[PDB]
């Protein structure tokens, strides 16, 4: 009956390039209650409004969450040509989306902090000709191809990652670089919401209130 956002509230949230995705169908949600547990610093949406996304029925609701430093807010926009939207995370274009930047309050101890913030700064294929470099831009609703060679938490800023590819996998090399951001006093996160309307299967509805 009710949509469960519990996995979000427990454990250490991953970095942006390893965003955790929750998919909701056939359930009732209370978005306002979820956001009341956090300090929402920023709440912007595309092809929908913050008020409307908390009060509409959908055929599916996708929620992506990850550790994200509040300072790099503008980098988390596709309008910007930053490494975040190029190599890490990229929301859908043909579907209404929302982006929430929140800070974990001290009374929410169930959410633990990672060692630091970190993201993919570079991600490219180095071909077998030892010359041509092919940048691997992340697609919507997909992970970076370099998530296989980039660790879940980057050790040092500007670290280098290199993996040799078999002929079957196009040969050459898979090459990536990662950046780090020092951990804030309180854990800061990002939330990516994507909704999709249908015809009859619009069963992801806001939890209404009764006597």
């Amino acid at each position, epitope marked *: 009956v009710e949509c469960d956002f519990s996995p979000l509230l427990s454990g250490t949230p991953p970095q942006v390039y390893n965003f955790k995705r929750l998919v909701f169908t056939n359930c009732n949600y209370n978005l306002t209650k979820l956001l009341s547990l956090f300090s929402v610093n920023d709440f912007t949406c595309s092809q929908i409004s913050p008020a409307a996304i908390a009060s509409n029925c959908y055929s599916s609701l996708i929620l992506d969450y990850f550790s994200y430093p509040l300072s790099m807010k503008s980098d988390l926009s596709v309008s910007s040509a930053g490494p975040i939207s190029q190599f890490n995370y990229k929301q859908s274009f043909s579907n209404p989306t929302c982006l929430i930047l929140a800070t974990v309050p001290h009374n929410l101890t169930t959410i633990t902090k990672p060692l630091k913030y970190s993201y993919i700064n*570079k991600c490219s294929r180095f071909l077998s000709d030892d010359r041509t470099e092919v940048p691997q831009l992340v697609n919507a609703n997909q992970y970076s191809p370099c998530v296989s060679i980039v660790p879940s938490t980057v050790w*040092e800023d500007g670290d280098y990652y290199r993996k040799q590819l078999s002929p079957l996998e196009g040969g050459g090399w898979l*090459v990536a670089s990662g950046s780090t951001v020092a951990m804030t006093e309180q854990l800061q996160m990002g939330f990516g919401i994507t909704v999709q309307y249908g015809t009859d299967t619009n069963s992801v509805c806001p939890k209404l209130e009764f006597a």
Partner: antibody, heavy 125, light 108 residues
Framework: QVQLVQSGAEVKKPGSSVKVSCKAS????????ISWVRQAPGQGLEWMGG????????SYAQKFQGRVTITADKSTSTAYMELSSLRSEDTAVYYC??????????????????WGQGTMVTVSS | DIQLTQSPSSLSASVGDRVTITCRAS??????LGWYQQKPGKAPKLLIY???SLQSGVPSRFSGSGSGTDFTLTISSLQPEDFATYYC?????????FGGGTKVEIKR
């Protein structure tokens, strides 16, 4: 079996700058990082910094930050180490070296398998 | 910064006997240690990477072991060409730190 060929010896006045080259010979940099190491007469080895040629990403020892610049020309596979405000304590042999084996944390850190012949730099009045 | 204490600073030895050089890190570095050899007037040479892995071509008389903090370079039966200076190096974190070095001279 790529080789690393460095530029010739350098004689500099105190306060000036020096720029040593490190070119890949009989091969290429490929996907490998290039570090720099110096050694003063009678002293041990010391890491100064390194660079990822493909990305131009450079890392430095905090000791030399502000006086050192490490670049790389990918079109010729030639790395460079520029050291400015030269002091007499900078009189040393400077080596370039390839990071052939990735450590457990990254690939711009690791064992240096191939070394250049070194470049002697003397700083004196 | 990771500090590497290489001991002993120097040792005298004859051709054919066992020689042990220890390197100790100020903190855990897993297996991210390298061993180098250097002759007077020449560039250092990689002997062992990943604490125990022998570099291609380097004689099997060189043996590295250890994991975490305490590492050891063992040379089982010294040859004339083995008399040189040996350096420890940690590969774990910045800055890349070398050990103080061990001078192996010939005992006569």
């Amino acid at each position: 079996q790529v080789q690393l060929v460095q530029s010739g010896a350098e004689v500099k006045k105190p306060g000036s700058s020096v720029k040593v080259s490190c070119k890949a010979s009989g091969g290429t940099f490929s996907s490998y990082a290039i570090s720099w190491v110096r050694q003063a007469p009678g002293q041990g080895l010391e890491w100064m910094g390194g660079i990822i040629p493909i990305f131009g990403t450079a890392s430095y020892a905090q000791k030399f930050q502000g006086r050192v610049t490490i670049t790389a020309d990918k079109s010729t596979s030639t790395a460079y180490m520029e050291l400015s405000s030269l002091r007499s304590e900078d009189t040393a042999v400077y080596y370039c070296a390839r990071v052939g084996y990735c450590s457990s944390t990254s690939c711009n850190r690791g064992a240096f398998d191939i070394w250049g012949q070194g470049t002697m730099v003397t700083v004196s009045s | 910064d990771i500090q590497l204490t290489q001991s002993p600073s120097s040792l005298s030895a004859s051709v054919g006997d066992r020689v042990t050089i220890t390197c100790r890190a100020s903190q855990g570095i897993r297996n991210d240690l390298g061993w180098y050899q250097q002759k007077p007037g020449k560039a250092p040479k990689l002997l062992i990477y990943a604490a125990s892995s022998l570099q291609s071509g380097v004689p099997s008389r060189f043996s590295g072991s250890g994991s975490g903090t305490d590492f050891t370079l063992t040379i089982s039966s010294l040859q004339p060409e083995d008399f040189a200076t040996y350096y420890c190096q940690q590969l774990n974190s910045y800055p890349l730190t070398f050990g103080g070095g061990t001078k192996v001279e010939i005992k006569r």
